[PDB]
Amino acid sequence: MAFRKSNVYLSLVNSYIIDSPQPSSINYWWNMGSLLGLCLVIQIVTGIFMAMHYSSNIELAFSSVEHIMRDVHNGYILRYLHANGASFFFMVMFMHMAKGLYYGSYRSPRVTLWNVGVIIFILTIATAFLGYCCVYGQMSHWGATVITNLFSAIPFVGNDIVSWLWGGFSVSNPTIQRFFALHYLVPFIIAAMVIMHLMALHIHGSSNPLGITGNLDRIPMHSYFIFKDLVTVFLFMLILALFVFYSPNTLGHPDNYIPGNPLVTPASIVPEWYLLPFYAILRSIPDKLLGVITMFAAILVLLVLPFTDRSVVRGNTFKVLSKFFFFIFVFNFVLLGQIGACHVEVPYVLMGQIATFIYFAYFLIIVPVISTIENVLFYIGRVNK
Amino acid sequence: MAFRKSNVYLSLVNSYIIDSPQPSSINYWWNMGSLLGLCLVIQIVTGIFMAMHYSSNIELAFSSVEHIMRDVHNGYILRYLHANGASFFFMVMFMHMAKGLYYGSYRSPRVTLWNVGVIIFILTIATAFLGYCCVYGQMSHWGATVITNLFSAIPFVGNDIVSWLWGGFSVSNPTIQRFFALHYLVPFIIAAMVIMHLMALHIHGSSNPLGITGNLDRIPMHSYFIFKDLVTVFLFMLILALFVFYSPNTLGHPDNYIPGNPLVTPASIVPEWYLLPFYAILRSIPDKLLGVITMFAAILVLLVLPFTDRSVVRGNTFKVLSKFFFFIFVFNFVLLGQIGACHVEVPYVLMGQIATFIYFAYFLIIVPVISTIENVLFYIGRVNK
Amino acid sequence: PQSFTSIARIGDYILKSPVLSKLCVPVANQFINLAGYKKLGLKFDDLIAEENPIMQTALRRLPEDESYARAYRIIRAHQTELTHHLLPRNEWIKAQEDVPYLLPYILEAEAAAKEKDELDNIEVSK
Amino acid sequence: MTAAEHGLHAPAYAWSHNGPFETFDHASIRRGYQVYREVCAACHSLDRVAWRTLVGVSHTNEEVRNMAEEFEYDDEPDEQGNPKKRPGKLSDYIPGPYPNEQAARAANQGALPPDLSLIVKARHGGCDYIFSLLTGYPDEPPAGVALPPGSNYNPYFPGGSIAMARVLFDDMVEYEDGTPATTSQMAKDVTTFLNWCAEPEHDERKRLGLKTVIILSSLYLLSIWVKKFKWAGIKTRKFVFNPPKPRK
Amino acid sequence: GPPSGKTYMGWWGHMGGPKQKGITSYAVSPYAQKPLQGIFHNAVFNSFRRFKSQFLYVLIPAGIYWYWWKNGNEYNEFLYSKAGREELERVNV
């Protein structure tokens, strides 16, 4: 018990920041998760500054956003940082999920961590939509109405629930005000559940790229991993500076920059780039309520992903067929996003339906059978007697 | 080991809420702290629900609460509960500080608790003063001007900080926007430091009315002290509901329900009741910076009490006359507040200096001499040679 | 999670079937030696996950020599992968040195645990 | 989709304000203001930006105040409550002939004029999009297409017909030089002015971005060196395995 | 402070891994080294070797899906060009 570890306030930091036994085989993929957390808190703080200098009334919402754009020092920078930070936040979330899935980090030691992350994703896509609603342009409230009509597909009741949620049959001050308030509030639940995520992580430790035990050797995080985090966040900040200064409004779409006027919709209406695959999974299935439930099934299939992979060897580095099919999966995901970007006509619908079919078939069928084949091949090849 | 202690979230809940070896001589005074915590939580919740239908515009702030009263369903409930809960929070907070002082809760194992509590006190001085400045009533602008101009006496920097606070060179939209933003945000800082306070307490435990070691008999928190907390909070809810529903104009002052207009205003301008003790003391010594430095002294005297007295026996229950002087001090506190309520005039102006002198003298000179005298009286009484 | 007894059953089914085994054994060993763990100086038993309690029970019965060699191989693999390098064809595990030293303990523990959990929840039906 | 109304992409032209180390050519923004105000006055609104940003980048000190004095801005009523008329201020917004919006839809013989303060980013493409839209339309529609009576044609713009009156005839601009009277010069002037109005921070943004990329590049290289430095003692440690003596 | 739950890994001194003997390490201070002794050899030879190793699993799905997307694009472009009045009617049935 030195002063650093005897004092409880400093002991809490000591167990997390000053000293924590991470393995020595960490690649550049876990500092990506730390970068995810840090860009999340950057988004939170710039949101606090916006809420300090933002007004949500319909008579002033567009007025407030253009005033923070133009009539304040260092104002437009805040909006550009918000847009680029949201885009990078979803990109790094996808990278985090890909790293978790490829390296077999959903297995028994951290199943609880896996479900915590899954529910984080489930509600953060919601909060992203809610923030998208707060713009109140010619397409933001448009997509908000789209989502309200989608949610109106609950069976056995259609009017009371949608009227209660959407503040009556019309849109007025309470609707947009409550939408802004809830986009302000949900990230606090994000922060709390991320605190839970880090608690579970610290309890159960971290995995390795080798897919093997890491207790053999360990090193403190401070003075070894803090500078790796520093260099990766410096690279991220350089890239973010490049996309915020030279070409700020590129990741977003040139549709939000219209004053509030839900009279004539623009010719080109597409969802933000982090939602196209789910728009595709909705468009493929020819049913409204069944389309909604299959979107939710696609989102929640990660919950049933564990206790379905019966590969004895953790990870996917030493197995060739599994990683080949994993690459097929990720390219199918990007193809689904790309096809959702374009319009719906022949023959895009057929191959989109095929893509959704191979997606769900992948998850529910192919990994168990190919993993069983991998295990039996592992057994048979080594034994020659 | 049971699953209740196995799961990390459940283990933390059990060890911090369900199971806690609290002492067996606990009175209602200790449940008053949990009651105050519940009051703080409900205050945050009702404030959040109030701000959802609130407008941050300068001209749409008083109009916002008017619209809440006259248009939204059960609008009066939220604001009445907010105001009365704030006042009750402050009264119960004074009660909690007094209970900590009288029972000798400031001894060596709880100096950290005393420091975090006094820090909460320091911030709580202004976290509601600025909330009252937000409403922009008929003395709210005056309170805002007082708080923004108290700091102008600092040498070599008197204009830069007040200009930063003003959002310019006067009081305008930036002032009210910043006021609302900080009154919203800094209660989250209160939440942070009260989590720290509870963490320190759970590390070190509570105390006993007797003043002796309580490590002999203990009972678990659940099913024993939960009922005491429940009955205390039921009584608090009953009295609070009766006041809010039947006598709305009792705790608050009928001065803020008038639009801000420095044109016609009465002379009956006096801050809210909980300011009076730390307001009469400011009008005793006749200078500008002297008032600020003596506020600093009056808030640091609560901090100097540890390692100041010489009472080897913890508490005042078993001391012949020290409790009498403590009662003198508490009645002097009440009388100082009441005389600060009255305007400045002879002999009340003359009473101010003597009241402040006694208020400081109990803290400075009374406690050590009275403790030493009590100790020597005990020593001469106990022995005969 | 997948029982090793089923793996042994499928293995013995394949090994004594002439045509299917003759078709599937050369591709099997070619897949094994293209997997890549041979180069890193890893035996196969060092790769299978060691977390769930049955694997811990199997590990606890290993003679000390095998555990020491396994620990050294894990440490060397971590060090080698940290530098993204590969030691030349001197540490490479030979073709016939990748014998399973941990299979019999796994099979015995699997059988014991399976029959324990089967007879624990049993009925008295004829 | 079908390219008939999807809109063929315009080629990437070369401008003065498309690059990493550039500024606005605001020696012509003083000319873009004139070209906008001479013809587009009673056509659109643009009423989103103020005059405090029109000083120091397009007009120096005085002509802005002359313009403010030139127009009446409907001052507050006097003590009798009667309406009056007053000169404009230097912190007001660019006015428009329509009271708020009513006089626009009545005279356009059709739709409403979109607010030009954001049209630069309101459409895909960007700076070259408006140039292509205002240049590529012929004077005669493609063969076989009979447009509605009173409507023009534009192949670049998705939609193939607009309520735009093709007021782009030359030979009546002539500021003080020989530059005007050709469509290219006025088109470049209007597109640069519209880009500036949509983003009146390009120079400052690029300067701050250059400073930021320089400082972050330096910091990134610094972190590279230090990470390769203090990890040198852990990336080179070697292990040697000596089998223990055979006795438990 | 009650002990926490049973977990395979813990704090220093009780990693939980197998007890080992016969392992010897050999570190040396970063001060007595060249911090970038072999950056070029790494970034050329090892980078190319890793790229060649991973060049058997990544490009094939990308190529096949690129062909699928391009074939769909060609079909779409050919459908709405001198065939929309005779071929597009017999595909939307």
Next chain:
Amino acid sequence: GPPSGKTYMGWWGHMGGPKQKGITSYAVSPYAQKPLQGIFHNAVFNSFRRFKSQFLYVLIPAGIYWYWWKNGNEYNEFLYSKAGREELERVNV
């Protein structure tokens, strides 16, 4: 979780109190008790005793401060009731 620093108390089983031996406790299963029968009498007696042990501590300070406030107020009526015209001068000068 991990062990903490210096503390004056622990958890159940190892709290850290003084070692003691020879104490016997009891209980009567509060279900079979019929707890309260003389609650009003118990409250009366407890209130009587509590008031008996604290005579002066509440009566004296409140009385002396009431007397002080009364003295101030009565000086005010000697001054501030149609009488300041001939004493405010000597107060302020």
Next chain:
Amino acid sequence: SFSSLYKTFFKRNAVFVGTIFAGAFVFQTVFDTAITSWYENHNKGKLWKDVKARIAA
């Protein structure tokens, strides 16, 4: 070449923070001035400094 004159400067800690912060401030100021000057002299005519003389007669 690292003589005792430079060796002595690498032992102060209590006062080195203030002077290092002042040096950082000076460096950032001179860097800002240099970048502003280079952005000025990389583009002539377009900027508003010389349009005053261009319109001058």
